[PDB]
Design a protein around this ligand. Structure first.
Ligand SMILES: *[C@@H]1O[C@H](CO)[C@@H](O[C@@H]2O[C@H](CO)[C@@H](O[C@@H]3O[C@H](CO[C@H]4O[C@H](CO)[C@@H](O)[C@H](O[C@H]5O[C@H](CO)[C@@H](O)[C@H](O)[C@@H]5O[C@H]5O[C@H](CO)[C@@H](O)[C@H](O)[C@@H]5O)[C@@H]4O)[C@@H](O)[C@H](O[C@H]4O[C@H](CO)[C@@H](O)[C@H](O)[C@@H]4O[C@@H]4O[C@H](CO)[C@@H](O)[C@H](O)[C@H]4NC(C)=O)[C@@H]3O)[C@H](O)[C@H]2NC(C)=O)[C@H](O)[C@H]1NC(C)=O
Ligand SMILES: *[C@@H]1O[C@H](CO)[C@@H](O[C@@H]2O[C@H](CO)[C@@H](O)[C@H](O)[C@H]2NC(C)=O)[C@H](O)[C@H]1NC(C)=O
Ligand SMILES: *[C@@H]1O[C@H](CO)[C@@H](O)[C@H](O)[C@H]1NC(C)=O
Ligand SMILES: *[C@@H]1O[C@H](CO)[C@@H](O)[C@H](O)[C@H]1NC(C)=O
Lengths: 44, 49
């Protein structure tokens, strides 16, 4: 059973189930490559 | 002393007319607020503090 290591088969996914579980346990800030300047302009 | 009170002491020659920030949001301005001066960008927000 290789299900956990495969990309599940709308827009196609880019992470396997185990990759999803690993990334969900790590807190990483979003650098905002596309439009982060305007998002930061929306101060809070 | 600087920054130990919510109000200030000012020489009369330094006083200027009040202006509003409503039409100057999200742009860099010089400010003077009850004697506290600086440069900055202002945005309307939910009240904290
Ligand atoms: C040849 O190569 C090129 C280059 O590789 C290929 O082109 C890429 O193809 C993919 C797939 O089609 C494109 O992906 C889509 O891009 C959409 C636009 O993304 C931008 O705008 C987003 C905001 O609108 C923004 O969030 C996004 O940036 C975040 O995500 C990217 C990764 O995708 C990160 O790198 C960024 O740092 C940033 O990350 C932050 O946010 C993430 C999301 O919360 C966090 O995970 C992350 O940690 C950060 O916090 C970017 O600037 C995007 O909208 C599309 O999203 C849909 O699909 C993905 C993948 O399945 C889902 O995860 C999304 O949820 C979303 O899902 C659903 O999509 C369908 C269809 O659109 C929609 O109907 C439905 O409503 C959506 N519903 C849901 C559940 O949300 C997607 O990511 C990519 O942009 C292309 N790159 C280009 C053109 O340069 C090309 O395909 C290759 N060709 C061949 C033949 O292979
Ligand atoms: C192979 O293993 C995966 C889990 O690693 C199994 O998938 C899970 O199955 C349970 C019970 O049906 C579901 O609640 C989970 O959501 C499934 N996880 C997924 C789909 O990632 C899978 O059924 C196994 N395959 C076989 C035939 O044994
Ligand atoms: C400042 O306000 C006073 C009182 O309204 C007014 O008399 C004065 O002309 C104003 N000064 C300027 C430069 O507009
Ligand atoms: C600023 O935000 C407050 C609270 O959200 C709102 O009541 C107020 O009207 C806003 N100010 C302006 C000038 O729109």
């Amino acid at each position: 059973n290789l299900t956990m290591l495969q990309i599940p088969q709308g827009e196609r996914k880019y992470r396997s189930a185990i990759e999803d579980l690993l990334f969900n346990k790590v807190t990483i800030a979003d650098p905002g490559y596309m439009q982060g300047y305007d998002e930061c302009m929306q101060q809070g | 002393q600087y920054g130990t009170d919510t109000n200030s002491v000012c020489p009369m020659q330094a006083l200027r007319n009040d202006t509003s920030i409503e039409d100057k949001l999200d742009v860099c301005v010089e400010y003077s607020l009850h004697g506290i001066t600086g440069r900055g960008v202002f945005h309307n927000c939910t009240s904290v503090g």
